[PDB]
Amino acid sequence: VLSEGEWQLVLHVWAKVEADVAGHGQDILIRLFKSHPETLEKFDRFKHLKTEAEMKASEDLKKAGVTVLTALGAILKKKGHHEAELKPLAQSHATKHKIPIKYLEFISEAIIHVLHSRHPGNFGADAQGAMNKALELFRKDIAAKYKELGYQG
Ligand code: HEM
Ligand SMILES: O=N[O-]
Ligand SMILES: O=N[O-]
Ligand SMILES: O=N[O-]
Ligand SMILES: O=N[O-]
Ligand SMILES: O=N[O-]
Ligand SMILES: O=N[O-]
Ligand SMILES: O=N[O-]
Protein backbone atom coordinates (compact mmCIF):
# COMPACT_ATOMS: atom_id res chain seq x y z
CA VAL A 1 0.00 0.00 0.00
CA LEU A 2 1.32 3.36 -1.06
CA SER A 3 1.19 6.49 1.00
CA GLU A 4 -0.56 9.60 -0.24
CA GLY A 5 2.90 11.24 -0.53
CA GLU A 6 4.12 8.31 -2.74
CA TRP A 7 1.01 8.71 -4.89
CA GLN A 8 1.71 12.41 -5.27
CA LEU A 9 5.27 11.66 -6.51
CA VAL A 10 3.73 9.22 -9.02
CA LEU A 11 1.12 11.68 -10.21
CA HIS A 12 3.60 14.67 -10.38
CA VAL A 13 5.79 12.83 -12.91
CA TRP A 14 2.70 11.48 -14.68
CA ALA A 15 1.61 15.05 -15.24
CA LYS A 16 4.73 15.61 -17.32
CA VAL A 17 4.10 12.45 -19.34
CA GLU A 18 0.70 13.94 -20.14
CA ALA A 19 2.35 16.95 -21.76
CA ASP A 20 3.06 14.61 -24.64
CA VAL A 21 1.67 11.16 -24.19
CA ALA A 22 2.37 10.03 -27.78
CA GLY A 23 6.06 10.91 -27.51
CA HIS A 24 6.44 9.20 -24.19
CA GLY A 25 4.61 6.10 -25.55
CA GLN A 26 6.98 5.88 -28.56
CA ASP A 27 10.06 6.12 -26.32
CA ILE A 28 8.68 3.53 -23.87
CA LEU A 29 7.62 0.93 -26.45
CA ILE A 30 10.82 1.38 -28.40
CA ARG A 31 12.88 0.90 -25.24
CA LEU A 32 10.90 -2.23 -24.46
CA PHE A 33 11.36 -3.66 -27.96
CA LYS A 34 15.08 -2.81 -28.04
CA SER A 35 15.76 -4.15 -24.55
CA HIS A 36 13.53 -7.31 -24.96
CA PRO A 37 12.98 -8.00 -28.68
CA GLU A 38 10.86 -11.05 -27.98
CA THR A 39 8.13 -8.71 -26.65
CA LEU A 40 7.63 -7.22 -30.18
CA GLU A 41 6.52 -10.64 -31.41
CA LYS A 42 3.28 -10.17 -29.41
CA PHE A 43 2.21 -7.32 -31.58
CA ASP A 44 0.90 -8.74 -34.85
CA ARG A 45 0.32 -5.38 -36.27
CA PHE A 46 3.92 -4.13 -36.22
CA LYS A 47 6.02 -7.12 -35.25
CA HIS A 48 7.74 -6.81 -38.68
CA LEU A 49 9.42 -3.50 -37.77
CA LYS A 50 13.16 -3.96 -37.96
CA THR A 51 14.75 -0.77 -36.66
CA GLU A 52 14.18 2.16 -34.27
CA ALA A 53 13.69 4.40 -37.22
CA GLU A 54 10.88 2.25 -38.55
CA MET A 55 9.41 2.14 -35.06
CA LYS A 56 9.49 5.99 -34.74
CA ALA A 57 7.75 6.36 -38.12
CA SER A 58 5.00 3.85 -37.29
CA GLU A 59 1.67 5.57 -36.73
CA ASP A 60 0.22 2.26 -35.41
CA LEU A 61 3.03 1.94 -32.82
CA LYS A 62 2.41 5.53 -31.78
CA LYS A 63 -1.28 4.82 -31.29
CA ALA A 64 -0.47 1.70 -29.24
CA GLY A 65 1.78 3.73 -27.01
CA VAL A 66 -0.95 6.32 -26.41
CA THR A 67 -3.38 3.50 -25.60
CA VAL A 68 -1.01 1.91 -23.10
CA LEU A 69 -0.08 5.05 -21.26
CA THR A 70 -3.66 6.39 -21.16
CA ALA A 71 -4.91 3.14 -19.65
CA LEU A 72 -2.00 3.10 -17.16
CA GLY A 73 -2.55 6.70 -16.31
CA ALA A 74 -6.21 6.03 -15.45
CA ILE A 75 -5.10 3.16 -13.20
CA LEU A 76 -2.46 5.35 -11.44
CA LYS A 77 -5.00 8.10 -10.87
CA LYS A 78 -7.13 5.59 -8.90
CA LYS A 79 -4.30 5.37 -6.37
CA GLY A 80 -4.74 1.63 -5.89
CA HIS A 81 -8.58 1.64 -6.22
CA HIS A 82 -8.29 0.20 -9.74
CA GLU A 83 -10.28 -3.04 -9.54
CA ALA A 84 -12.74 -1.89 -12.31
CA GLU A 85 -9.96 -0.78 -14.63
CA LEU A 86 -7.94 -3.94 -14.16
CA LYS A 87 -10.76 -6.37 -15.06
CA PRO A 88 -10.88 -5.85 -18.83
CA LEU A 89 -7.17 -5.26 -19.10
CA ALA A 90 -6.29 -8.47 -17.27
CA GLN A 91 -8.78 -10.37 -19.35
CA SER A 92 -7.44 -9.22 -22.71
CA HIS A 93 -3.74 -9.52 -21.74
CA ALA A 94 -4.24 -13.00 -20.22
CA THR A 95 -6.57 -14.48 -22.82
CA LYS A 96 -6.18 -12.63 -26.09
CA HIS A 97 -2.64 -11.28 -26.11
CA LYS A 98 -1.01 -13.80 -23.75
CA ILE A 99 1.29 -11.37 -21.93
CA PRO A 100 3.31 -13.00 -19.21
CA ILE A 101 4.04 -11.13 -15.92
CA LYS A 102 7.71 -11.19 -16.98
CA TYR A 103 6.74 -8.95 -19.92
CA LEU A 104 4.81 -6.55 -17.65
CA GLU A 105 8.05 -6.40 -15.60
CA PHE A 106 9.96 -5.49 -18.81
CA ILE A 107 7.52 -2.65 -19.67
CA SER A 108 7.68 -1.35 -16.11
CA GLU A 109 11.47 -1.26 -16.51
CA ALA A 110 11.07 0.63 -19.79
CA ILE A 111 8.70 3.15 -18.17
CA ILE A 112 11.17 3.80 -15.35
CA HIS A 113 14.05 4.06 -17.81
CA VAL A 114 12.26 6.73 -19.98
CA LEU A 115 10.98 8.75 -17.00
CA HIS A 116 14.48 8.75 -15.50
CA SER A 117 15.91 10.01 -18.81
CA ARG A 118 13.21 12.61 -19.59
CA HIS A 119 12.25 13.88 -16.12
CA PRO A 120 15.15 14.25 -13.79
CA GLY A 121 13.24 17.26 -12.26
CA ASN A 122 10.41 14.98 -11.20
CA PHE A 123 12.10 11.57 -11.09
CA GLY A 124 14.79 11.55 -8.40
CA ALA A 125 15.27 8.51 -6.21
CA ASP A 126 12.22 9.02 -3.98
CA ALA A 127 9.94 9.56 -7.02
CA GLN A 128 11.38 6.49 -8.80
CA GLY A 129 10.84 4.39 -5.70
CA ALA A 130 7.21 5.59 -5.53
CA MET A 131 6.66 4.78 -9.21
CA ASN A 132 8.26 1.37 -8.74
CA LYS A 133 5.92 0.73 -5.81
CA ALA A 134 2.90 1.78 -7.94
CA LEU A 135 3.99 -0.47 -10.82
CA GLU A 136 4.68 -3.37 -8.44
CA LEU A 137 1.11 -2.97 -7.06
CA PHE A 138 -0.25 -2.96 -10.60
CA ARG A 139 1.65 -6.15 -11.48
CA LYS A 140 0.69 -7.79 -8.19
CA ASP A 141 -3.01 -7.10 -8.72
CA ILE A 142 -2.84 -8.08 -12.43
CA ALA A 143 -1.05 -11.30 -11.47
CA ALA A 144 -3.86 -12.16 -8.98
CA LYS A 145 -6.43 -11.51 -11.71
CA TYR A 146 -4.52 -13.66 -14.21
CA LYS A 147 -4.71 -16.56 -11.70
CA GLU A 148 -8.48 -15.99 -11.28
CA LEU A 149 -8.82 -15.99 -15.09
CA GLY A 150 -6.89 -19.27 -15.46
CA TYR A 151 -3.63 -17.88 -16.91
CA GLN A 152 -0.39 -18.77 -15.32
CA GLY A 153 1.28 -15.54 -16.53
C1 HEM B 1 1.51 -1.06 -18.41
C2 HEM B 1 1.19 -2.17 -19.10
C3 HEM B 1 0.16 -2.28 -20.14
C4 HEM B 1 -1.00 -1.60 -20.35
C5 HEM B 1 -1.61 -0.58 -19.40
C6 HEM B 1 -1.56 -2.06 -21.60
C7 HEM B 1 -2.74 -1.62 -22.14
C8 HEM B 1 -3.30 -2.02 -23.33
C9 HEM B 1 -4.53 -1.55 -23.81
C10 HEM B 1 -5.44 -0.55 -23.18
C11 HEM B 1 -4.76 -2.17 -24.98
C12 HEM B 1 -5.99 -2.03 -25.82
C13 HEM B 1 -7.20 -2.80 -25.29
C14 HEM B 1 -6.90 -4.24 -24.89
O1 HEM B 1 -6.64 -5.07 -25.82
O2 HEM B 1 -6.91 -4.52 -23.64
C15 HEM B 1 -3.66 -3.04 -25.23
C16 HEM B 1 -3.51 -3.92 -26.32
C17 HEM B 1 -2.42 -4.77 -26.44
N1 HEM B 1 -1.42 -4.93 -25.58
FE1 HEM B 1 -1.09 -3.95 -23.90
N2 HEM B 1 -0.74 -2.95 -22.12
C18 HEM B 1 0.30 -3.13 -21.33
C19 HEM B 1 1.36 -4.00 -21.55
C20 HEM B 1 1.53 -4.83 -22.63
C21 HEM B 1 2.71 -5.57 -22.92
C22 HEM B 1 3.96 -5.63 -22.09
C23 HEM B 1 2.50 -6.24 -24.12
C24 HEM B 1 3.43 -7.15 -24.88
C25 HEM B 1 4.70 -7.48 -24.57
C26 HEM B 1 1.19 -5.91 -24.51
C27 HEM B 1 0.55 -6.36 -25.65
C28 HEM B 1 -0.63 -5.89 -26.11
C29 HEM B 1 -1.15 -6.33 -27.41
C30 HEM B 1 -0.49 -7.39 -28.29
C31 HEM B 1 -2.24 -5.63 -27.64
C32 HEM B 1 -3.21 -5.62 -28.80
C33 HEM B 1 -2.66 -4.42 -29.70
C34 HEM B 1 -3.20 -4.45 -31.13
O3 HEM B 1 -4.42 -4.61 -31.36
O4 HEM B 1 -2.38 -4.38 -32.10
N3 HEM B 1 0.65 -4.99 -23.62
N4 HEM B 1 -2.74 -2.97 -24.18
O1 LIG C 1 4.45 9.90 3.82
N1 LIG C 1 5.03 9.73 2.74
O2 LIG C 1 5.45 8.46 2.38
O1 LIG D 1 15.38 3.04 -26.76
N1 LIG D 1 16.26 3.10 -25.67
O2 LIG D 1 17.22 2.33 -25.58
O1 LIG E 1 -6.07 6.18 -27.40
N1 LIG E 1 -6.11 6.73 -26.07
O2 LIG E 1 -6.43 6.04 -25.11
O1 LIG F 1 -7.16 -4.89 -7.38
N1 LIG F 1 -7.58 -4.96 -8.55
O2 LIG F 1 -7.70 -6.19 -9.08
O1 LIG G 1 -15.10 -6.72 -16.81
N1 LIG G 1 -14.45 -6.82 -18.04
O2 LIG G 1 -14.46 -7.89 -18.61
O1 LIG H 1 -10.97 -9.40 -23.74
N1 LIG H 1 -10.63 -8.87 -25.04
O2 LIG H 1 -9.72 -9.15 -25.89
O1 LIG I 1 14.21 -0.90 -20.30
N1 LIG I 1 14.91 -1.08 -19.17
O2 LIG I 1 15.93 -0.50 -18.77
From Swiss-Prot:
The modification Phosphoserine is found at S3. Its EC number is 1.7.-.-, 1.11.1.-. Residues 1-147 form the Globin domain. It comes from the Eukaryota. One of its GO terms (molecular function) is heme binding. Its main location: cytoplasm. O2 binds at A64. InterPro entries: Globin, Globin-like_sf, Myoglobin. It is found in: Cytoplasm, Sarcoplasm. It is an enzyme of class 1 (oxidoreductase). The keyword Glycosyltransferase does not apply. GO terms for cellular component: extracellular exosome; sarcoplasm. Heme b binds at H93. The modification Phosphothreonine is found at T67. Belongs to the globin family. Monomeric. This is Myoglobin. The lineage of its organism: Eukaryota, Metazoa, Chordata, Craniata, Vertebrata.
